[PDB]
Design a protein around this ligand. Structure first.
Ligand SMILES: [Zn+2]
Ligand SMILES: [Zn+2]
Ligand SMILES: [Zn+2]
Length: 227
């Protein structure tokens, strides 16, 4: 990229569907290496919504600038859970008067962590961030207590966030393996029609990713009985 030194990989902005872009950012995360984090930028008639933020303030300005530079007013940001791979750019967007959204639970968990909260918050299993266009859904505790997914109804796309772990559940300290199968069950129950499922840390797949995550969630409940 355009810098002066070694290389943590640059932010990626790739067009998924007609009004849906994927964004990938990368962070050193001890016990793992470079971790990729996928989010979405959803478009409505000249307005952009960040589904999750990049890891850092730095890539968040990057992502916002790209779309502002192509004619889009950044109309808001939804964080899918309180971990910094979804929330790490909330402070930047707050200082720029861009509405940041998170679930009431995400904001209290942000609070207990001493992190900056999203400015708006929603309470309840549902929340239309933009009615008939972006839907927030709470399948239940899993990756974290507060993790949510974001559904686009005219594209049948499902940002699963870190709740979707097709090939292994990953970091487990803040997780609820006992509740995760039930949420993964109820998630596929509602969004079986997912044409595309964008997870946080694995590449975009399809409806089976709901099936793959379900069966990985129940596999961790199995491994619970180790002694
Ligand atoms: Zn997480
Ligand atoms: Zn994550
Ligand atoms: Zn990727």
């Amino acid at each position: 990229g355009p810098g002066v030194g070694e290389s943590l990989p640059d932010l990626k902005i790739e067009k998924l569907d007609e009004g849906v872009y994927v964004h990938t950012s990368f962070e050193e995360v001890n016990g793992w290496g470079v971790v990729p984090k996928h989010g979405l930028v959803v478009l409505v008639n000249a307005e952009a919504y960040l589904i999750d933020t990049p890891f850092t303030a730095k890539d968040t300005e990057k992502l916002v600038t790209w779309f502002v530079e192509r004619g889009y007013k950044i109309k808001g940001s939804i964080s899918s859970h309180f971990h910094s791979d979804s929330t790490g750019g909330i402070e930047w967007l707050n200082s720029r008067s861009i509405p940041t959204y998170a679930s009431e639970l995400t904001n209290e968990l942000l609070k207990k962590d001493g992190k900056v909260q999203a400015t708006n918050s929603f309470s309840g299993v549902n929340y239309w961030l933009v009615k008939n266009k972006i839907e927030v859904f709470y399948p239940g505790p899993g990756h974290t207590p507060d993790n949510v997914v974001v559904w686009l109804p005219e594209r049948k796309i499902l940002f699963g966030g870190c709740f979707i772990k097709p090939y292994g559940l990953g970091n487990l300290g803040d997780a609820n393996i006992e509740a995760w199968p039930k949420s993964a069950k109820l998630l596929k129950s509602k969004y079986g029609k997912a044409k595309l499922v964008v997870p946080s840390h694995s590449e975009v797949g399809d409806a089976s990713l709901l099936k793959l995550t379900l069966e990985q969630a129940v596999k961790g409940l199995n491994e619970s009985k180790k002694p």
